[PDB]
Symmetry: C3
Subunit: 321 residues, 3 copies
Amino acid sequence: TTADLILINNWYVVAKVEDCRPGSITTAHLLGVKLVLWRSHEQNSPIQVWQDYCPHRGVPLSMGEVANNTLVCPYHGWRYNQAGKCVQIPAHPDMVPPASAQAKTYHCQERYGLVWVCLGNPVNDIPSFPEWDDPNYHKTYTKSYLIQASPFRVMDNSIDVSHFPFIHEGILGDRNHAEVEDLEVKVDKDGLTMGKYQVHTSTKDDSMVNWFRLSHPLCQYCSTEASEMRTVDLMVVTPIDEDNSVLRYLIMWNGSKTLESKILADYDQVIEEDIRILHSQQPTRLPLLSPLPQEIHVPSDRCTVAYRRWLKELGVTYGVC
Amino acid sequence: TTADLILINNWYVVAKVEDCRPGSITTAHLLGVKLVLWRSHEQNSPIQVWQDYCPHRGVPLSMGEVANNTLVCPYHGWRYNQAGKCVQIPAHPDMVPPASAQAKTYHCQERYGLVWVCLGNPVNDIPSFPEWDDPNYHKTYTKSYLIQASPFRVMDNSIDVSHFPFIHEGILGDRNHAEVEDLEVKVDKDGLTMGKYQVHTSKFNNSTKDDSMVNWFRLSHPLCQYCSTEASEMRTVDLMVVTPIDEDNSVLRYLIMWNGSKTLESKILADYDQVIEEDIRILHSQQPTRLPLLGLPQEIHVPSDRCTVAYRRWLKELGVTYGVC
Amino acid sequence: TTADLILINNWYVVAKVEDCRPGSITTAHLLGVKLVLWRSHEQNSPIQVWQDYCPHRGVPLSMGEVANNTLVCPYHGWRYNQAGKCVQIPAHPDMVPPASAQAKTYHCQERYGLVWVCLGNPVNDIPSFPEWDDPNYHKTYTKSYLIQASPFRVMDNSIDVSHFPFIHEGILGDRAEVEDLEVKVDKDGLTMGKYQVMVNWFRLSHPLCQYCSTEASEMRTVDLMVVTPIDEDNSVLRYLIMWNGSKTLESKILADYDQVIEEDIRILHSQQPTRLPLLSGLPQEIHVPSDRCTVAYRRWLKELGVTYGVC
Ligand code: FES
Ligand code: FES
Ligand code: FES
Ligand SMILES: [Fe+3]
Ligand SMILES: [Fe+3]
Ligand SMILES: [Fe+3]
């Protein structure tokens, strides 16, 4: 609503396809807009994403029911077809509903088992995820995490690597290996790419090789390679509004399928360790570079500074300060 | 208080008389103003309705006591008489209190077992309720319902009749039978009147005839509604009264009267409760929370909305800007 | 931070010294600023009081860990020494931390068993409390009371004497005439003359600390009432109480104070508006002769230029 056109015109994940099943009604919130998500009882029916608002008298359509490939609002029973047009008004069953009688519909695309939404007119496509079609990679999904922090602070914390030995001790690092190597960062028209850097953990030694790339500011493609196992993930942040976010991960890996529950637990521990910091930080919104006291930057922050720099040019004013 | 003068100079119910016993101290809220209502320990004492504020040091007078026909603020024990004029300060008991030690008082009338209050000069009368004095009619009162919606939304839902087959399915209709007949709506000198309209009720007792309900209602005031319901062998009338707490919050009460057997009173209360709670579910979710008058897309109107539309037009005529958008 | 300079440059109690143990990290809130209060593990190490803020990425340092005379940010492990200078950045262990890597520190002193804080520059000293040096007097501390009231309303209720017979009936008065009162506002601050209740008087050298004296037919009890201004609309109340009667009456003294206190708090929580009205709920305050001390306090605050927590 008060978000910049550059965010309104991008794709974001609002749900996993698994939490929307045939006949269901679910709700989401994206950039200050309340959304209703529904499908027909039909197997493989498409997913509609609309503003959660019946235009007759302002009741949430989410409180309605799916019946006969239509969503029926629960106040006066108007029925809206899959295109959002009202097709039956029960008070006047032979009146053709006025043209006005139409739900606000949004672009929706199902990809990687994720439900993607764009509130405006999409200028880019949904980010790539090459491993999706690779049969030697297994896949899994975290649950969704509600976070009381800017979406841009969520991504800022995910781009920050020097904190691993301190809040992620025992999984991504340890206090006896806290020094950070030179980090190569490039911001270009592709997006922000951080070059391969090395993580101490639990083939030369107890370390891993990681890189990541952001084609868009709220979706991150990460890669980590162990001795004989590669894991990749798509991290994707729902910007609920300027101060609140949903975090989800799609995770694929080419090692044993027995690692799934271990990966799920590792992510849950790391995410919760991050949330404790994120909820604590002030200000709530992500501070941008100088064009309480101003944020200080040392060399291991060069990727975080590049992110703030990239947001400034991108003209992001929403959820930042 | 940002309430329009139209609203300020009208009467509203803030309590049931039977809940304000002699010697009692009650609180309420009306149009953004906090109120204290207190009575003398004497039988048949009048009710005083004042702003709940001691102007000495800003404590609520409702936290004090009633004694010797005065309200006493507990902080320093200043004593306020029926007219609000403080008559004694215990720290200087032979001194005459300053003339500014005066409670802000309001107009109060008891009518139909209800406490009516006007925070400004009461232009209008309390609405009529002709069957009050008719001894063929028994009386009962619902509980009060605190509702997180604008008072004008609460009343607009009350005027809406096309929602009966959906959120009142099982008692005021069914989805299958949902067509609405065209309605007659008048907005004259008498306020807003909806003419007689048939209501298809849902079958409960199969030994009995279909009820075949006929209703009409009038609003002389925008937050008080008089409804008349002719049944199979029973007339029921009700005065529906909406207290405007502020622009976004309301209290709903009904005074119900009927000329059938007095044994139905539990029946009637339970049936009103079930339909009120289904309306409150809808009212609590509606957006925007203030009532739109004639971000979010504007409201749509179809012919079934004739009554509602007339209500919104009436509110603009009256100049209502409080609780509306 | 939006607080007036005259308030910035005075001392306030934020804690009891016994709650600041070696190695500990605690928090407080003062004039809208959030504070961290910690000590090294060395016996007789001093108390540091900083703004609870890591300047790197805005994390509360009070979520950190005290190590080797340093406070360690939990997020990237930066270590701050007892002067609040960042001594170590673990990602660059061979690098001199830059000058801006520096905690905002404040003045702190211990006195009367309390932790006193000045967020600005200390011109006056911590108020006097003569009986502290008098070993004929035993001492005791109430618990702290968090109050949803302006600190100046809290103190105003403490300088109103006419309400004793009404909300404190049974301990402090009985239902009520008030004697002519003596109030003296000069350099010494605000002083109220000896008055019978039992004979009481009190002094405020500063606007949020009060020294009160009560003499009974057998003993003298004094107390230092020190209110913490958390913000414009919130206060912490504490009392240090000293008496020269038997040491066995500590229980009952503390029960009496707790009893009257909660009685005062019932009133304070209900008062409107929240902030104390100075002399200039919709209607204006009215004053009668027994308000002479509370009138003097409002006058004193406006001559001082207090705008925070008032009207
Ligand atoms: S509000 Fe949706 S049908 Fe009337
Ligand atoms: S505040 Fe009511 S008598 Fe003092
Ligand atoms: S936030 Fe404190 S060290 Fe980075
Ligand atoms: Fe992390
Ligand atoms: Fe209804
Ligand atoms: Fe008191």
